[PDB]
Amino acid sequence: ATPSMMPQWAYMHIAGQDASEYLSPGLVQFARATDTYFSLGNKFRNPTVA
Amino acid sequence: QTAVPSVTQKKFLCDRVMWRIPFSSNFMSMGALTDLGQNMLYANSAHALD
């Protein structure tokens, strides 16, 4: 990767850390429980880096 | 029996599709953020395009 562009990548989640991992521990635990009826998966971006 | 000589012309149709040239080394889809569009050569300098 390019170490200079990483701050913009990480902050905008173009190339970051897997939204299941950067959300606060409360939210991911919350969204996991209530995924059956009210799903929050498509709200947050989880990047893929080649 | 009467089979007057002929010449063959081939062709093809492709609708509802946009030609694609992925910006990757091997044209694959190893990730959303391509490997070539991540190298220092392209992400730390300005290049023209013709």
């Binding site: 850390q17 897997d18 989880n46 893929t48 880096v49 | 990730g31």
Partner: peptide, 28 residues
């Protein structure tokens, strides 16, 4: 880790998993 560095990173960790060494299928 040298072999594991060749896999796409879905976030931070690579995409390795689900060992699918197959090739048993025949007529049956």
């Amino acid at each position: 880790i040298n072999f594991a560095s060749l896999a796409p990173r879905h976030g931070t960790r690579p995409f390795m998993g689900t060992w699918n060494e197959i090739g048993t299928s025949q007529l049956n």
